Design a protein around this nucleic acid. Structure first.
Ligand code: MG
Ligand code: MG
Ligand code: MG
Ligand code: MG
Ligand code: MG
Ligand code: MG
Ligand code: MG
Ligand code: MG
Ligand code: MG
Ligand code: MG
Ligand code: MG
Ligand code: MG
Ligand code: MG
Ligand code: MG
Ligand code: MG
Ligand code: MG
Ligand code: MG
Ligand code: MG
Ligand code: MG
Ligand code: MG
Ligand code: MG
Ligand code: MG
Ligand code: MG
Ligand code: MG
Ligand code: MG
Ligand code: MG
Ligand code: MG
Ligand code: MG
Ligand code: MG
Ligand code: MG
Ligand code: MG
Ligand code: MG
Ligand code: MG
Ligand code: MG
Ligand code: MG
Ligand code: MG
Ligand code: MG
Ligand code: MG
Ligand code: MG
Ligand code: MG
Ligand code: MG
Ligand code: MG
Ligand code: MG
Ligand code: MG
Ligand code: MG
Ligand code: MG
Ligand code: MG
Ligand code: MG
Ligand code: MG
Ligand code: MG
Ligand code: MG
Ligand code: MG
Ligand code: MG
Ligand code: MG
Ligand code: MG
Ligand code: MG
Ligand code: MG
Ligand code: MG
Ligand code: MG
Ligand code: MG
Ligand code: MG
Ligand code: MG
Ligand code: MG
Ligand code: MG
Ligand code: MG
Ligand code: MG
Ligand code: MG
Ligand code: MG
Ligand code: MG
Ligand code: MG
Ligand code: MG
Ligand code: MG
Ligand code: MG
Ligand code: MG
Ligand code: MG
Ligand code: MG
Ligand code: MG
Ligand code: MG
Ligand code: MG
Ligand code: MG
Ligand code: MG
Ligand code: MG
Ligand code: MG
Ligand code: MG
Ligand code: MG
Ligand code: MG
Ligand code: MG
Ligand code: MG
Ligand code: MG
Ligand code: MG
Ligand code: MG
Ligand code: MG
Ligand code: MG
Ligand code: MG
Ligand code: MG
Ligand code: MG
Ligand code: MG
Ligand code: MG
Ligand code: MG
Length: 203
RNA sequence: AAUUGAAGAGUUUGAUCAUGGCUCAGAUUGAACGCUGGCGGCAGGCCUAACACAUGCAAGUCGAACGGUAACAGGAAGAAGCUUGCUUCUUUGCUGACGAGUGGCGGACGGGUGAGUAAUGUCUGGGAAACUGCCUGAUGGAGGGGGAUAACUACUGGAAAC
RNA sequence: UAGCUAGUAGGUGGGGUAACGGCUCACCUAGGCGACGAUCCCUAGCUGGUCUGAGAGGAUGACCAGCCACACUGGAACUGAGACACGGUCCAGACUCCUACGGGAGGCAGCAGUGGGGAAUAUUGCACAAUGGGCGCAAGCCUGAUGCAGCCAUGCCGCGUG
RNA sequence: CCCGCAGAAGAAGCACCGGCUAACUCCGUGCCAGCAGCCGCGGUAAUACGGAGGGUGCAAGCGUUAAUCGGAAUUACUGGGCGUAAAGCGCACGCAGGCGGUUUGUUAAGUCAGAUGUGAAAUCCCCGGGCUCAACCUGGGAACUGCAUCUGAUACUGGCAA
RNA sequence: CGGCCGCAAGGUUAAAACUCAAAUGAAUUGACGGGGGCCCGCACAAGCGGUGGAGCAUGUGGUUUAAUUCGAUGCAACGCGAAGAACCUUACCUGGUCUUGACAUCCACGGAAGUUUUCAGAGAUGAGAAUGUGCCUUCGGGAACCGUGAGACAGGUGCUGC
RNA sequence: UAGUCCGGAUUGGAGUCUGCAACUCGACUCCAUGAAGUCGGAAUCGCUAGUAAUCGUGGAUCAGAAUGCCACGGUGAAUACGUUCCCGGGCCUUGUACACACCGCCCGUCACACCAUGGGAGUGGGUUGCAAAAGAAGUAGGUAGCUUAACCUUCGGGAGGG
RNA sequence: AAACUGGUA
RNA sequence: CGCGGGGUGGAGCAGCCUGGUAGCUCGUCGCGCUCAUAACGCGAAGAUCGUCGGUUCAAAUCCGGCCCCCGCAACCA
RNA sequence: AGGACCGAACCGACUAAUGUUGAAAAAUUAGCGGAUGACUUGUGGCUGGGGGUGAAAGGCCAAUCAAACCGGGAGAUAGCU
RNA sequence: AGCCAGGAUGUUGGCUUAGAAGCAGCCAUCAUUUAAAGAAAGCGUAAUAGCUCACUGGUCGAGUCGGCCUGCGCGGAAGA
RNA sequence: ACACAGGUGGUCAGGUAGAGAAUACCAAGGCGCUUGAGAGAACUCGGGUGAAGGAACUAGGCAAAAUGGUGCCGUAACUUC
RNA sequence: AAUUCCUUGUCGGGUAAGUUCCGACCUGCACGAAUGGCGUAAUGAUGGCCAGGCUGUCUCCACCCGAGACUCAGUGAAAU
RNA sequence: GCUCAACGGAUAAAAGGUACUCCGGGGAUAACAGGCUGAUACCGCCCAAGAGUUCAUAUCGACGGCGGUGUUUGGCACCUCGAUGUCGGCUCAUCACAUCCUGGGGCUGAAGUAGGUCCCAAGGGUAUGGCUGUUCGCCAUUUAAAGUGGUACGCGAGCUGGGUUUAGAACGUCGUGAGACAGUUCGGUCCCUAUCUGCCGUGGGCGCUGGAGAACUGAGGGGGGCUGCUCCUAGUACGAGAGGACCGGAGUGGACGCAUCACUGGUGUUCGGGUUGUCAUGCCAAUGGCACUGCCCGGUAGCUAAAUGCGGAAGAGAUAAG
């Protein structure tokens, strides 16, 4: 929800801008005008915009001293425009910004378990051979045993022989330590991936 | 004539008496809100932001203090196209008056507010070392001179204010 | 909140005010206030009165009347009998407005009225006919004081809805 | 303010009904929905919730909320308490402070008596008068319980002397 | 929290927000006590015979079933209601039937009651043939009883033993 | 002196009998088979005299049904020293924070939710003490600079003002 | 010798 | 190829110089005790001695193989 | 009074620059610490090497110290260059 | 292979359609009329239309089309 | 090792200013340091000044710059007072 | 944390931006009580961080004063 | 009679530390750098299921395949152990193009503006800070852009010394201990006068055919080449609107470079003045020396930046992609 507190100089302007803003309401995100009025921005308008995280917009009006008191004390998003199209552009920008970042995954590593070992803190650690890609320190992982998901989490411990490492490229041996992954069995595959964003926008 | 003045109840316990709190019945208000609403008389009406203000009005008056004709309500002279003796038009302060100016009185009253002030203010009761426009009583003067300035004219700076 | 005060308390002389006075200076003394509450901190205009109560007391100071303080904020003085002056002056400050960008103006806590705040509180009205003030010999002019009217069941009282 | 025409025509609502507290039945619901100042009602026969009928109270008003006093002798001066309900310091010595045996004299401070002055008006109260009654307005009185000065009393308290 | 005191532990002075309708003292009656005293019962002790072990009868719980009808549940339910479930009893299950009805009562019409057999069908049940057509009888009918029809009704071993 | 001439369940075959009806689901009889069971754990029950123990007979319900219920008789014991205790009950007294009356009441940590509150490195404001800098306007004091219509003058200038 | 506890209204 | 002890029922356990009916603690299913629960008591199911080969009426106790666990060595991923 | 304070002589050596075939085999310039004390200094004496001394750094013992210097075993040995 | 012509619609198939008869989209995945035509491959038209592909008629006229095996070349080919 | 910017104990110690044996200029006294003369370039060393900005420099305010005396007034948290 | 690998752990403060610093959290790889634990006024040519002043440290160097460097005369090295 | 099992059997009889170290050797053997290689990494290409509403190839692209570079992580041990100084920073650079900006084009799922992808192009240009030793990285805030790599991971006989491999000390951890950690923490000597090559400047000799003084031509070489914003065209083309051009002109900036002191300033120990202490010129007065030019205030010329003038071009020829 995008909350708007709209005050304009003329009632015709108020009633035109309200419907112009309502027309562009998308299913994913909507816009509500909690307050709509004619005249300068008042302390009541400031309080109403403080209650809900609203954008306090004045079409051809300016805040008085009393309203500016609350505006200074609590920092709200006060906006002054002179063109309905500028106001609509800003509202569309806010609506688009409110959207989700579109989390997506892609495989960047692959290892096969061999020669299970033991550890005091993490319990049973897996001695993996990286077959393709790269495996990083703290990235989400998926354990597959015969192409069926067994474990979902994040790679916690990654060292070689004796030294902790941040990454291991394909072709080297590595040790993977996940305390909750206690059913370590030879032949298991581990997929490593990261998270990518596309940052959708309304259109 | 002016002193005709004083009520209790519910609630702790199985029940009782105490102690002790809470609650209610009364009166009152610069009240607000809900439902409803015919008339009249008297009174009251920003208690919060001593927060900010568009616009109009709320302190003027004296020509019987004095220079004056900027309005113009009269009159007279004169010059004139003449209604043919009655009109008109420039001077003229004689004039009923009077914009602007000097001068006198008033603007310290009336009106508004409760910020500040814990006594440097207020209430009560006293005092001595004081002034007092206008209003009133009494006793006495009110003689003779001088130099300026506003207004008004001639220039000049100004968008305005000046 | 237990200690507070150096012009501080007293005296001589000068100065100053309408008037007494550390009111102000020079000098001399070390004094003065405080447990009967000094100093410090919080709150608040005071009274006649109003409410309540049998009374004593408790709460309160809205209207009317008396006194005090203030006039956008801070400061100063002039004029005047009387001001350290609500609709005066000068300086400084915050804010607002006009500008030809050279430069200027402003003070509703006066009566109406507007924005804002709030649960909440009215007409941008008529007249100087009466009373009372300012000027004037008077006539007369001015007077949002005042007299009236408009809005509100806000209160008290009276009548009707047969 | 008086007169004339017509016509019951234009004019009644709010709260409450278990006890406190004046006023009872039915239906719906079934610890749900709801009520509630206090005690507290509602878990299938509710005088306590919702509706209807009936009744009680007030009336151009009625009810709710806010605030003060009263009831509250529940800050007890009038007018309370501390063995066990709250409440005697663990005990003692002692400054300031409070109180103090008996005889006389004196003072006259406390105390009491009389007089004078004062205690604004309005408001409160008593007797009257005017708005068609009332509210309201208004004449006189009383009160304004206080404060100051003067003149006296000397029982008691205080001071001085013995 | 602040102040003072103490090496420390801590001591002394001493609140507010918030929450409840109570908290509390003395005493009365009852109950209870791993308090005391006295007394009684096949209560214990001293004995006999048992149950709990095995087979069987019966009831109950549980389970299953179309139904396994409904009750009764520590002592004080469990050979209990039940002093007699193969039909009935018997409500419960599945099927087949009826709607003023199996039973009471009001009304109309028709028909003696009853005794004999036959078709279909598990039966109930429908569907025929028979036989019979008597007492009172005011000669339009009643009383004993049968069939059909309408409406008031009849009916419930359905729930609440709080 | 044994799983037996004890023990009788189960089971097969064959029969008697009530009743419309013995298969779900009756009683009795004849032949055959002959399980478990050789005195029974924790625990628990009745009985003090014709009692217990054991042995037969009858009745109700009922067409047909008992090891159940009710009822009659034959044979016929052991042990009770005593109230020290389990259970229950009665009376007197005592303690109680109990009164849905000990199957009462009631405490604290810990897990969850909400409300207010203390400490807290810091952050943002208001007021104010002390020590300094700062000096608009105004008032007062002092003035070799400039300027000046009222008074004086020797007419050159003085006094005084700005 | 030991001898706990008792949902709410 | 790495230093010792082991392996009894669902879990933990007794039989060692003593090779003779598989027993005891805790768990599961019952019964009793109590108004009821806990506690407590009485009972039942439950087994190649970790797994095989020599020895032997016999079974880790006399031995020899296989498998598993643990004291450390067990690297350390 | 003080293993008190500031600060010269005096005793040190924290920073920087220079120098690094130096003026010097550790110094110069500018700063810096202590400066009545566990202080500093002159003269003389004692402790001798698997030993001494050490408010401890494996520090010092004549420009040399995880075992001083001089002479000898000695032409030690060197699977090494 | 060019050029001169046909090269269409039985039938807006149902439907959509700015104005869709093959071409902006679905079902339909068939067949006559026919020298010759697929209810159609596409530019194009505010859909047809205009203009085109397959097939065939005429003019022109002798070569033309696509595979296989082979020799030598071309691109793929950026570094201090 | 040098006619070496180093080290070396004691005694005397004047004037002006100054607390002073610090520091500055002088007296008595002693010295100009055993290669010079020119020029007035990069670069190095030792110094002075610097518009506006003022740590942005750097591992780091290194180095520089800055403060600096006597008298009087005044002075916080904390504290073993 | 003079102790924490993961690690620039998370939150708050400071900045404009803070792997450093200060205050907390506790998941203490791998604190801990005379190999002392936790505090602590004063002290320190001790380690870390911040602020005022100050500045050629720096943006970005410029000019000037002396000693060398350069030229002339005398003497006259060194590593390799 | 020996698990002399290290099994041709050094003793009957035997473990460690050295960062306090020392000697003799080795590039017969590692760490830095070079060399070979190219598994890995980076870049390119082949096929095309599929995504893209329809549509493989606007943009991506599964399962698979083929190459280039020398460029990361690796392999080898060929050079250097009678010495090739190692990370980061400063100063100074130079090359490649697989192009970050600027320039020219094709395609687009390119209406305009703004974008995506590919081709040609190396002339010029290509950030300051906060934190960390930090190259990198995150963050703040700019720019037209804040390019990727080679050069002994360019550059210590140019500088630094923060990290890191000496000696001191401590924490955690391991060890009985000496001690150790590729864990942390505080402190800790950076030498060289340039012979040759090279480079930046400046001279002498001879030659060029009689000698000498001048002015030239120009084979050849070097320097330079960057770019923002505002206005007009024009609120026009394009679009429903919002918004908003190509092409072509003008003006004013940033960085960089050259020149020059007319101006604004710095310096100006060679000019004038003020002033503290002290000494001297016989003394007063007036002067001089010393104390950083004693301290300080101004300031001529010259040199200078912060000051003010100019520059990068237009044009022509032959071309790359097209
Ligand atoms: Mg007027
Ligand atoms: Mg006039
Ligand atoms: Mg007044
Ligand atoms: Mg005097
Ligand atoms: Mg006085
Ligand atoms: Mg009372
Ligand atoms: Mg009061
Ligand atoms: Mg005056
Ligand atoms: Mg006035
Ligand atoms: Mg006004
Ligand atoms: Mg007003
Ligand atoms: Mg409002
Ligand atoms: Mg009334
Ligand atoms: Mg009643
Ligand atoms: Mg009901
Ligand atoms: Mg009272
Ligand atoms: Mg009391
Ligand atoms: Mg006592
Ligand atoms: Mg006493
Ligand atoms: Mg007495
Ligand atoms: Mg008296
Ligand atoms: Mg009357
Ligand atoms: Mg009266
Ligand atoms: Mg009065
Ligand atoms: Mg007396
Ligand atoms: Mg305290
Ligand atoms: Mg008996
Ligand atoms: Mg017994
Ligand atoms: Mg039995
Ligand atoms: Mg029932
Ligand atoms: Mg039953
Ligand atoms: Mg039941
Ligand atoms: Mg039946
Ligand atoms: Mg009952
Ligand atoms: Mg038999
Ligand atoms: Mg037997
Ligand atoms: Mg029978
Ligand atoms: Mg009895
Ligand atoms: Mg209990
Ligand atoms: Mg707090
Ligand atoms: Mg002044
Ligand atoms: Mg419990
Ligand atoms: Mg000392
Ligand atoms: Mg010192
Ligand atoms: Mg040192
Ligand atoms: Mg020195
Ligand atoms: Mg010291
Ligand atoms: Mg050591
Ligand atoms: Mg030595
Ligand atoms: Mg030795
Ligand atoms: Mg020998
Ligand atoms: Mg030899
Ligand atoms: Mg050898
Ligand atoms: Mg080829
Ligand atoms: Mg010499
Ligand atoms: Mg010497
Ligand atoms: Mg000496
Ligand atoms: Mg020089
Ligand atoms: Mg220099
Ligand atoms: Mg300097
Ligand atoms: Mg100078
Ligand atoms: Mg500067
Ligand atoms: Mg400056
Ligand atoms: Mg500064
Ligand atoms: Mg930097
Ligand atoms: Mg320094
Ligand atoms: Mg300095
Ligand atoms: Mg770390
Ligand atoms: Mg900083
Ligand atoms: Mg910290
Ligand atoms: Mg430790
Ligand atoms: Mg210990
Ligand atoms: Mg030389
Ligand atoms: Mg020479
Ligand atoms: Mg030589
Ligand atoms: Mg061998
Ligand atoms: Mg060490
Ligand atoms: Mg060696
Ligand atoms: Mg080699
Ligand atoms: Mg190498
Ligand atoms: Mg390599
Ligand atoms: Mg080899
Ligand atoms: Mg090499
Ligand atoms: Mg060599
Ligand atoms: Mg290219
Ligand atoms: Mg060119
Ligand atoms: Mg390098
Ligand atoms: Mg490089
Ligand atoms: Mg080099
Ligand atoms: Mg380097
Ligand atoms: Mg270092
Ligand atoms: Mg070039
Ligand atoms: Mg010049
Ligand atoms: Mg100058
Ligand atoms: Mg000079
Ligand atoms: Mg002199
Ligand atoms: Mg001299
Ligand atoms: Mg000298
Ligand atoms: Mg060109």
């Amino acid at each position: 929800e995008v909350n708007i507190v709209l005050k304009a100089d003329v009632q015709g302007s108020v009633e035109a801008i309200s419907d112009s803003l309502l027309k562009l309401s998308t299913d994913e995100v909507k816009v509500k005008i909690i307050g709509s009025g004619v005249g300068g921005i008042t302390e009541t308008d400031a309080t109403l915009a403080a209650a809900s995280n609203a954008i306090l917009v004045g079409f051809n009006v300016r805040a008085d001293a009393s309203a500016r008191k609350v505006i200074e004390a609590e920092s709200l998003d006060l906006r002054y425009y002179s063109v309905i199209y500028n106001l609509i552009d800003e509202v569309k920008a806010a609506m688009s910004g409110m959207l989700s970042p579109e989390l997506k995954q892609q495989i960047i590593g692959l290892a096969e378990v061999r020669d299970v070992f033991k550890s005091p803190k993490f319990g049973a650690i897996a001695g993996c051979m990286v077959t393709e890609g790269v495996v990083k320190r703290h990235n989400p992982i998926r354990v597959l045993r015969d192409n069926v998901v067994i474990y979902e989490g994040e790679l916690e411990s990654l060292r070689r022989f004796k030294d902790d490492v941040n990454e291991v490229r394909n072709g080297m041996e590595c040790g993977i330590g996940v305390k909750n992954y206690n059913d370590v069995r030879t032949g298991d595959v581990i997929e490593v991936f990261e998270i990518i964003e596309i940052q959708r926008t309304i259109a």
